[PDB]
Amino acid sequence: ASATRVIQKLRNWASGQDLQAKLQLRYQEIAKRTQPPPKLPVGPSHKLSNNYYCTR
Amino acid sequence: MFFINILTLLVPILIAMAFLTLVERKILGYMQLRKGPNIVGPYGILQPFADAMKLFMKEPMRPLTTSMSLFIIAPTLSLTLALSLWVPLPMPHPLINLNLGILFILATSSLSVYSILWSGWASNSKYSLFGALRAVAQTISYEVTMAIILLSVLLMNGSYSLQTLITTQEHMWLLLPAWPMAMMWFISTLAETNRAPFDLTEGESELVGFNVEYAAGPFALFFMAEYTNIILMNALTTIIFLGPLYYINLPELYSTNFMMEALLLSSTFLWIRASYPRFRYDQLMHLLWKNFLPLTLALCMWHISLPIFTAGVPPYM
Amino acid sequence: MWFEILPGLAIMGVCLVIPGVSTAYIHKFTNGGKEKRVARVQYQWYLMERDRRISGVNRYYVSKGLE
Amino acid sequence: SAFLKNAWAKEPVLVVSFSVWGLAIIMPMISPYTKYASMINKATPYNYPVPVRDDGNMPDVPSHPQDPLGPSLDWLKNL
Amino acid sequence: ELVEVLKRGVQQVTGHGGLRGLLRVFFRANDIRIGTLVGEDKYGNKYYEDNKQFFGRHRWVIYTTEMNGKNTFWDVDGSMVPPEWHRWLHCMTDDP
Amino acid sequence: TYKYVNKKEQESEVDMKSATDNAARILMWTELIRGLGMTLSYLFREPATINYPFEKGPLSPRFRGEHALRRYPSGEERCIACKLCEAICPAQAITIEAEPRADGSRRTTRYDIDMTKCIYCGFCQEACPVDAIVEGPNFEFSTETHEELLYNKEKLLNNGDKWEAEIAANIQADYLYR
Amino acid sequence: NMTLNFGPQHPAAHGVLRLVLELSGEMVRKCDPHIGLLHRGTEKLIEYKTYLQALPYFDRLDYVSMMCNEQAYSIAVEKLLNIQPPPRAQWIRVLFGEITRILNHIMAVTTHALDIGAMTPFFWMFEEREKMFEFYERVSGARMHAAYIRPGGVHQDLPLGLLDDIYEFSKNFSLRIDEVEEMLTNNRIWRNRTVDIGVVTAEDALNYGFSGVMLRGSGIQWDLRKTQPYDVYDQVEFDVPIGSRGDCYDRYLCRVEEMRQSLRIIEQCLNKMPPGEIKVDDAKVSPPKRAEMKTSMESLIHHFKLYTEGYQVPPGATYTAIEAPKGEFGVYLVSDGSSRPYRCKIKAPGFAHLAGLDKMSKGHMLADVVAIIGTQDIVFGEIDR
Amino acid sequence: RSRAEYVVTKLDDLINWARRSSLWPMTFGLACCAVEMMHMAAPRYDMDRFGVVFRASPRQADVMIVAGTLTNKMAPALRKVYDQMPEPRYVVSMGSCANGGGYYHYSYSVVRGCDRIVPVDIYVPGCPPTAEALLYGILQLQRKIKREQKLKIWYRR
Amino acid sequence: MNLYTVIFINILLSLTLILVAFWLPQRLPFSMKFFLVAITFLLFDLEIALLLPLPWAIQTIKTSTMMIMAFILVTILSLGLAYEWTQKGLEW
Ligand SMILES: COC1=C(OC)C(=O)C(CC=C(C)C)=C(C)C1=O
Ligand code: SF4
Ligand code: SF4
């Protein structure tokens, strides 16, 4: 991006595609770092009852 | 003064040779989403000089099994013929104008095929000999159509002297007429400089042949030769088919436009390289002998007929 | 950005115009401000030589009606 | 004809190749200018035209180049 | 249009101090680009960020002139960056 | 569900118009020109390369990188020589021998990670109960001599002290996930 | 016949290949590929290593399709333990499995072109490949050689930003395939170099055990992903790109289609990934969570034993095949009751393909052989093992 | 400055700069480390920028990067290619498989390091040594090449 | 002479390079196809010769004979090519 319109137009044409819509270089669209803290889910078998291993 | 002129033609051309290499390593880069060499020097300007010095310093290796002359004659011949062919070129004024100028360029090019043959025999390793034999064949084949394409041109120019075309192309480029051959001159110029679409002479994936046993100084000289040629042949396209505007009062606008057209067509074979896969050895000869030679021989006859029945026989001299 | 390729091209170009301007002014200096005569055919060499004999030793010097 | 068609679309070089071979073998035969080539080149004066003695028995030869007699290239002019 | 790009170019060139500064950057960092100093570590390295540029090149470090004695004018190596500021440079943490 | 690639559904019979279009494709290299346009297009795109020393390719917190041994904030090295980091190392890289320190505490007399043997799996990071051995962020530790790559307890502990601040931040970010 | 060997250093030889060629002139009449230059002893080393500490080895057999390789060991060991991965993990393995087939195909299509002489396609896609590794590194910590897919379930949950970033890559990736699509699919020069080269007939392909795009390219309709659906390949919809004729072009076109079809599968996985746990909840098979091992005795005992000794999978033997990007990758794991395996025969799609080179490269030039190896997508790690 | 010592220090500085700026590497291409460099050659971390040749035949190669395990069947070859490289030549060992045996150290078919076969100048660590990590290693070779003082040693020899 | 001056500088420049380059640092591959090509090449190369004077011959007063001759030469060689194609020649 950050390309003068004319270069973009030349780009889009020479390529035959609207390459601007889907640029390869990433700009402020990528997930920000330090995404929020994760509280992951505990799966089955964590029941404190009727959880006999012999049955699983 | 003549020497001054000798220096003015060779030194600048050689420097241009060097920077073509840099330009080849940046235009190919940006096409492939990469900056190319910019860290050594400012914007990579010192990059060509840097590896030249690395190449000359590294030990030249003479294979145990190698001739020691057909080995050192080969790069000397390659650089000598290529730099020599810039001697008789109209820009617009030629350093040594020769009445049979285009025959000089055709003959001098033809001699370079030996360097490939001599280097391949000299190396005495299988990869080199196989590469040289196919290579000589490519180069020679692309000479037969290369020559006929010029003969068609000359017959519409009236003479073999490259200086005449500046007067032939005072109203229109010879591309408009004869475009069908330009294309065929351009493709043949791509073969004779062993550039990409036709780089089987020295395929890398195929036989990593011409410089297999050549490193350091010998590598460089051919190397230099190839790139100077890359320019020269492009420059011949820019005189024979794309005729730069000539004004007798100011001779440099001829050279200014010669500069512009040569750089763009030199840029084109750089652009061709990155854009196309390399042709097969027989696919390459299939093109010249089947696709192009019948087109060229017939269009050759059309260029002996166009003059006569259009009462346009060109003025000798 | 592509403009970085330009520095290299410029240096190539400057080095491809020098030759054409150089050869075409080291001629107009050595030949006395007049383009070096191109003697394609003998007649021209004759006329050229004739000129030499006509004045000095160099053909570029050119005598006129006042001689 | 049908092959001709495919030939026009497959192996479309030879077709063009031959076509030109012929068109160059025809235009010369039929053209309003073909004759000029042998004239325009004939006229171009390269070797000095040596003058003949005047026996005085020749009314065809012009006694002076600018005379109203002799050959003319007005055909070349306004060609 | 084109004038704009030339203009931003001037900004960049004139931005890194005087010509002295530009040459300092032009020749050792090989990039005349202006960003916002996000901090200067005790070693001397100066870190900058330009969120406008692509992810790859929005955060850069202009290394010091001398680190731990050694001259680092030209012999710049990555490890020069301090461990604290290493993750900021590699985008491990979005916080300076 | 299948899909034919390169299967011509039917035999389009040549029509002059079709033939011309094709012949033009062979004669004037039309598709070849199409390919040149694509590369010219990118020539105008911004290059994706990064100044390597000045800018660095992004690595998130789990990047394994270079081994380090951490210490408790107090200053007591975390490792208690349970030696299962040695047990689960796939390459046999970690060598640990231990003896009760004078304090009476359990500690490793010798902890040697052979980095040339190590394949940076990150299981040691996983296995440690006190999480004393961690995969540190640094990846730039190329060394002139092979011996430098072999690492004893003092190099790793020193590596741990140098990168502890970032290691702590990285473990802080990813521990909920583990 | 002028015997000439395609020595290892040559770039077209994938680093290690000594094809003894007999050149009947430039036409090559016989090839005797001498592999073994990268045999590392991968399957004799595994016998001395516990099931978890042998996972890493499976990321290095085919080194361009790491996770799909480690999904074959993970499925095998899981079968021998009669345990199944949790629902979220199975989607994550299918999500990572298709990122790997896009990654292998970008490898195979672009490096084939590098061999033929087209250089730009490699650079455009390789930038798209580091975008992808980042996804490996952000989920496992290793750009390649992750060790993420574990014998039971996967190792750690996806970071909280990965699925958005995989959408942004998949959203724009297809234009990138479209772009090399234009630059290397109709070039007369490519077609001539690739079309009608190394044709393999349908029955010959089955007999030579080709089992891959080489099987599908000649028209045989076989995908282990739809025929024998492993993991969740029963809940995702895709079209196998069967080619018609078998030339190296039809095989290229199939590889380009599978990249497109994988984007269709990746889309479904992001759209339908279930909330849940990433590893089976049996502490006996998958290691206990970091907080649990540091607060509950049953978990420390289970962590200590699993890391130090192992799963101790029940005695048995299984051959589990998954559709790895190259072809059918299968592990014949024979197991005694011990925590370390007894035998692990890695079937490499590639040992069979390289055998076919002599038959496929028949009546062909020195240059054709470079295309023939390129269209088998052979990585010598899998062949040499 | 004026001293035969100063002229001989400046001129190697020149000779060292040329070798440093243009290192044409030759990758054997063993195992997978070759991929982690094909990524260095690729656009995110271009090597050419630094003056590095993506593909160079042995006779025209300054640096050999051994990526991947050196089995006991490829050893006899590596040495040949190292021996056939032009004299000014340097080796960078990439991967725990090459600098040391790495996983596969104890195998019967793997040489435990390429240092046993070819003298090694920089050892780049990591199972897939990251691509920046190789780029740091190549840059470390450039720091080693700057320090070399061949002309100074000949003068005071 | 002017050419001689230029050329010897040209050789000197190349010999200088190779010399510094070497001084500063201080069995049966045969396919008739290949031979056949070389031959064809000269048959074509000779023809190129018989075709080279055509620029001077254009100005010949005859013209009719010129073209009649030139067209016959190009056509008979092309037929040579034609038979080369028809035969296994040119089919490598
Ligand atoms: C993609 O397949 C392969 C290549 O060819 C394109 C190789 O070049 C190589 C090695 C190549 C070099 C010289 C880096 C390997 C390992 C490979 O797997
Ligand atoms: S596991 Fe952690 S603590 Fe136990 S020994 Fe290995 S490092 Fe020290
Ligand atoms: S080191 Fe790690 S990555 Fe490099 S080869 Fe050996 S295993 Fe593959």
DSSP string, C24-51: HHHHHHHTTTSPPP---SHHHHHHHHHH
Contacts of C52 (CB under 8 A, 6+ apart): C58, C59
- Ligand 3 in reach of H30 Cβ (< 6 A): no
Q: Is the dihedral of CA B273, B274, B275, B281 positive or negative?
A: positive
CA dihedral (B233, B236, B242, B248) in degrees, to 10, reads 150
Contacts of F125 (CB under 8 A, 6+ apart): F64, F131, F133, F134, F135
Question: CB of F130 within 8 A of CB of G304?
Answer: no
Q: Whose CA is nearest to atom 2 of ligand 3?
A: H127
- For the CA of H29, the nearest ligand: 1
C-alpha H70/C-alpha H47 separation (Å) is 24
Question: CB of G150 within 8 A of CB of G74?
Answer: yes
Contacts of G297 (CB under 8 A, 6+ apart): none
Looking at the DSSP bridge assignments, the partners of residue F136 are F66
Question: Domains (ranges, CATH) in chain G?
Answer: 1-385 (1.10.645.10)
Alpha-carbon gap: F99 to the closest alpha carbon of chain E (Å): 33
Chain CA centroid to CA H115, Å: 12
Q: Which residues of G touch A29 (CB under 8 A)?
A: 168
Chain CA centroid to CA H114, Å: 12
Kindly state the tokens that stand for E7: 């203009």
Render the burial of G127-150: b for 16+ CB within 10 Å, e for the rest. bbbbbbbbbbbbbbbbbbbbbbbb
Closest CA to B85 of B100, B106, B99: B106
Closest CA to H92 of H144, H31, H148, H16: H144
Tell whether B291 is within 8 A of chain H (Cβ): no
C-alpha G310/C-alpha G53 separation (Å) is 9
- Its domain, for residue H17, covers 3-157
Kindly state the tokens that stand for G63: 């080194």
Helix (H, G, I), strand (E, B) or coil at G22: strand
Nearest ligand 3 atom to the CA of H68 is 5
Nearest ligand 3 atom to the CA of G63 is 8
Residue of chain B whose Cα is closest to the Cα of C16: B259
- For the CA of F88, the nearest ligand: 2
Within 10 A of G207 (CB to CB), how many other CB atoms are there? 11
Kindly state the tokens that stand for G327: 């072809």
C-alpha E22/C-alpha E44 separation (Å) is 18
Q: Rounded to whole angstroms, what are the CA distances from C22 to B260, C31, F75, G29, H103?
A: 17, 14, 77, 58, 66
Number of domains in chain H: 1
Label residue I84 left, alpha or beta by phi (over 0 means left) and psi (-120 to 50 means alpha): alpha
C-alpha G136/C-alpha G141 separation (Å) is 7
- Segment B203-207 long-range contacts (CB within 8 Å, at least 24 positions apart): B203/B131, B203/B278, B203/G117, B203/G367, B204/G11, B204/G117, B204/H55, B204/H57, B205/G10, B205/G11, B205/G12, B205/G114, B205/G115, B205/G116, B205/G117, B205/G370, B206/G12, B206/G366, B206/G367, B206/G370, B207/B127, B207/B130, B207/B131, B207/G366
Within 10 A of C63 (CB to CB), how many other CB atoms are there? 10
Pocket perturbation via mutation, ligand 3, pick of G60, G133, G379, G382 by most ligand atoms within 8 A of CB: G60
Ramachandran angles phi, psi of G71, nearest 5°: -100, -20
Which residue spans within G272-327 are E strands per DSSP?
A: 316-323
Ramachandran angles phi, psi of G327, nearest 5°: 165, -150
Kindly state the tokens that stand for E60: 């850069």
Residues of chain E with a following break (C to N over 2.5 Å): none
DSSP code string of F97-163: EEEE-TTS-EEEEEEEEETTT-----HHHHH-SS--EEEES-----BSSHHHHEE-HHHHHHHHHHH
C-alpha I17/C-alpha I13 separation (Å) is 6
Q: Is the CB of G243 less than 8 angstroms away from the CB of F4?
A: yes
Kindly state the tokens that stand for G240: 């196998």
C-alpha F58/C-alpha G272 separation (Å) is 28
Of H31, H77, H103, the CB nearest to G56: H103
Contacts of B26 (CB under 8 A, 6+ apart): B35, B36, B37, B38, B44, C4, C5, C8
Kindly state the tokens that stand for F170: 């990285």
- For the CA of G307, the nearest ligand: 2
Residue F165 CB burial class (10 angstroms; 0-12, 13-18, ≥19): middle
At H153, which CATH number?
A: 3.40.50.12280
Question: Domains (ranges, CATH) in chain I?
Answer: 2-92 (1.20.58.1610)
Closest CA to B228 of B42, B81, B44, B82: B82
Q: Residues near ligand 2 with C-beta < 6 Å?
A: F 79-85, 96, 127-128, 130, 132-133
Question: CB of B250 within 8 A of CB of G95?
Answer: no
Strand ranges across the sheet with H122-124: H25-27, H63-67, H90-94, H122-124
Question: CB of B123 within 8 A of CB of B66?
Answer: yes
C-alpha B232/C-alpha B262 separation (Å) is 9
Helix (H, G, I), strand (E, B) or coil at G347: strand
Question: CB of H33 within 8 A of CB of H92?
Answer: no
Q: Is the dihedral of CA G63, G69, G74, G79 positive or negative?
A: negative
C-alpha G239/C-alpha G231 separation (Å) is 17
Alpha-carbon gap: G325 to the closest alpha carbon of chain B (Å): 24
Q: Whose CA is nearest to atom 3 of ligand 2?
A: F79
- Annotated ligand binding at F128? The verdict is yes
Q: Rounded to whole angstroms, what are the CA distances from F169 to A32, A33, G132?
A: 17, 13, 25
C-alpha F60/C-alpha F63 separation (Å) is 6
> Could you tell me where the DSSP H helices lie in H22-149?
35-41, 75-84, 131-147
- Report the run of H or E that residue G4 belongs to, with start and end: strand G4-6
Tell whether I22 is within 8 A of chain B (Cβ): yes
Kindly state the tokens that stand for B279: 């042709």
Q: What is the DSSP letter of G31?
A: E
Resolution in A: 3.2
Alpha-carbon gap: I31 to the closest alpha carbon of chain B (Å): 10
Within 10 A of G245 (CB to CB), how many other CB atoms are there? 16
Chain CA centroid to CA G228, Å: 17
* Helix axes of B2-31 and B47-57: crossing angle, nearest 10 degrees: 100
N-to-C CA span, chain E:
35
Domain boundaries, chain B: 2-317
Tell whether A31 is within 8 A of chain E (Cβ): no
Q: Rounded to whole angstroms, what are the CA distances from B76 to B81, B85, B222, I5?
A: 9, 14, 8, 17
C-alpha G60/C-alpha G42 separation (Å) is 9
> Could you tell me where the DSSP H helices lie in chain I?
2-23, 32-51, 54-58, 64-86
Kindly state the tokens that stand for B140: 């020679």
CA dihedral (G282, G288, G293, G299) in degrees, to 10, reads 20
Closest CA to B135 of B78, B79, B186, B65: B78
Half-sphere exposure of C11 (CA within 13 A, CB side): 22
Q: Whose CA is nearest to atom 6 of ligand 3?
A: H97
Place of tokens 């992951």: A40
Question: CB of H128 within 8 A of CB of G136?
Answer: no
- Report the run of H or E that residue D22 belongs to, with start and end: helix D12-26
Residue of chain D whose Cα is closest to the Cα of F19: D9
Closest CA to H42 of B118, A36, F47: F47
C-alpha I74/C-alpha B298 separation (Å) is 8
C-alpha B280/C-alpha B270 separation (Å) is 20
Question: CB of B228 within 8 A of CB of C19?
Answer: no
Residue of chain B whose Cα is closest to the Cα of C39: B99
Helix (H, G, I), strand (E, B) or coil at D64: coil
Ligand 1 centroid to residue G15 C-alpha, Å: 6
Q: What is the DSSP letter of H59?
A: G
